[model samples]
Target: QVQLQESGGGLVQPGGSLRLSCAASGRTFSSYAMGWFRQAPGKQREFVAAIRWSGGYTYYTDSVKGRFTISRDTTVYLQMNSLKPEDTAVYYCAATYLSSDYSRYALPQRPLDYDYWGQGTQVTVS
Candidate 1:
């Protein structure tokens, strides 16, 4: 079984920045892509950012393009900048395999739907 655990969250001031950590284990860390998402109170889930395994590529939602970043070492990281009240949400980290292509040179688009999700960390902007 693969395990992804997330940590880092709490009250943050508006205009401040927040950084979350997602520790990966139970599998080769660089074997799967990692993604970050969020859900605000009474709101639906939203994809914030994702990074392909081994630093191959990255994707981000339109709204978070410049303000949010997804990076990783053996552990995945999500950094949110310029926080606001609307940015308050439960952030989750996920992992996924490379769709159907088993080749190392597979295209970057590997069906981004997540495979495993962390328990989630809540961030509140006050």
Candidate 2:
């Protein structure tokens, strides 16, 4: 089975940037887009952005465009940046692909329902 693991510092001083990485095993990183989501203390999960492996193109949610960036290293581990107190959340990274039978539609539009998830890394800014 495919699995994702998140690792990073648990605390960040106010105004400081938080960095995190998500490593994948059992799957080829290039076959799918890597997505990041944020869920602050008592709020719902919000789609942060998605990154393509080949061209490093990123598609971020309008609500968090300036404050977030997602990139992958040559090792296939993904990283994030530009964190703030409000950005504190249990961050997750997920992968998805288009169904061969449905060429026009992406099979897992957000996985918002918690169908797939990472081990999760909690980050807090104080």
Candidate 3:
């Protein structure tokens, strides 16, 4: 079974920046894509962004577009360049194996995702 470990500090000052990471193991990284999610205190979850290990492609939610930068290497890295109090949330990263899309040679054309996940990193923004 595959797994993920999200690492980050618990707090960030308003307008500050933060970088989070998710380490991957027990699975072939070349065949999967990873996604980052955010869950605010007492609020619903939000899709943050995603990056493909198979080809270095990336995607971000419309609202988070300018503030988040997602990348991958030995692990997936998510950098939030600006922060707000509302951005305070429990963050998570998960993996998924797709049967198509990448194999066909282009990303963003087909988008099916997710399978297993980690417990999420609890973070505070103020």
Candidate 4:
């Protein structure tokens, strides 16, 4: 089992910045990639960024290209800049349980998804 939890400041002023933490358990966190997501109230879940657990390489969506970042050490981290009220949402951290759990010989795409995740940390920018 793999799980991630998000911890961070709950409120941010417009144009300010904030950081969120993702803590992993149930396995060696650095063995797999951790992806962070954001979801606004009544909106769909959006992928913010993903970080390679070992080397710390990261990829971010264009929506959050410049304002968002992903990295890890003891735990995964998500940082956002130029905060706005529109940024209010519940942030989540998740990772694949294990590739072998899906298929030991899978190809093209690994059997990883947000199947294992944590309760979101609600962030409200005013």
Candidate 5:
């Protein structure tokens, strides 16, 4: 079974920055699509971004456009440069194995449901 552990994020003042990380194990990182999700204070979970290691593609939501950065190597990472009260939430890291993109190389052109989720890191920006 796949496993994910999240670290970083806690309390911060507005205008500060933070980098969240997700450590992955029990599977080959290159065969999965790693993603970050956000659950705002009193709000439901929302998709922030995803990086498909197999296809080498990155996808993001319009809400976080120009506001965040995402990447991965053996582990997944999310960086928020500017912080605000609205940024207070729990960030989760999840992954799903890639299948195909209707091509021969088995490219991952889309993201499906998450197969594994981290415990999540809470960020409180005051």
Candidate 6:
């Protein structure tokens, strides 16, 4: 029964940084890659980035790669950085990789669509 909770400032001034947190419960954070996504107030969903637990490696979507970063806190909460107005959206954090019968991590190429998702933290930039 893994669960994720997101917390952050609801409003951000233009050109200012927006910070958000995703707290993981009911699971050990070390075994999964945490992923983040964004959906504008009225637009389609988009991939933001992902962080691997073991080595702290990050992979970002090209559109937002230059301005977004993903990191984990000591308590296994995921944090985001360098946010902007265009970043205004509902952000989500979830575990990556669906373990396969072969015991290898299967990273979904097409958006995993986050079959299971948190309610999402809504953020606005002005």
Best by lDDT: 1
In terms of TM-score, which candidate is strongest? 1
Which segments of candidate 1 are over 4 A away from where they belong? 29-31, 102-112
Q: TM-score for every candidate vs. truth?
A: 0.86, 0.76, 0.85, 0.81, 0.84, 0.76
Ranked by lDDT, top first: 1, 5, 3, 4, 6, 2
Compose the digit string of candidate 1's lDDT tens values, residues 16-126: 998999987877444477788889999878878877776467878888889988887668888889998998999888887765555554323222467788999899999
In model 3, the Cα lDDT at residue 48 comes to 86
Return the clash pairs for model 1, or none. none
lDDT per residue for candidate 3 within 24-68, as digits (tens), equals: 887755567778888887777777888777667777888789999
lDDT against true structure, model 4: 0.73
Q: Give candidates' CA RMSD values in order.
A: 2.9, 3.3, 2.9, 4.2, 3.1, 3.2
Q: Any residue pairs clashing in model 2, and if so which?
A: none
> What lDDT is reached at residue 31 by model 6?
42
lDDT of 2 by residue, 5-107 (tens): 7777498887667667777666544345567777788787778777655556567778667766677772233333555577778877776543335323232
The local lDDT score (0 to 100) that residue 89 gets in candidate 3 is: 86
lDDT of 5 by residue, 1-126 (tens): 569999897998899888889888877544667789888867878888878666567777887778888887678888887888888899888887654443323323232477778888898999
Total backbone collisions, model 2: 0
Query: Per-residue CA lDDT of candidate 4, range 1-126, in tens?
Result: 666677994989999999999888777542466777778989888878876555555677777888887776658888899888988998888776345443322211221465677788899999
The collision pairs in model 5 are none
Arranged by TM-score with the best first, the candidates are 1, 3, 5, 4, 6, 2
The local lDDT score (0 to 100) that residue 96 gets in candidate 4 is: 60
Scored against the true structure, residue 79 in model 3 reaches a CA lDDT of: 93
Model 4's TM-score against the true structure: 0.81
lDDT of each: 0.79, 0.63, 0.76, 0.73, 0.77, 0.64
- In angstroms, how far off is 32's CA in candidate 2? 1.0
> Which parts of model 3 have CA positions greater than 4 angstroms off?
101-112
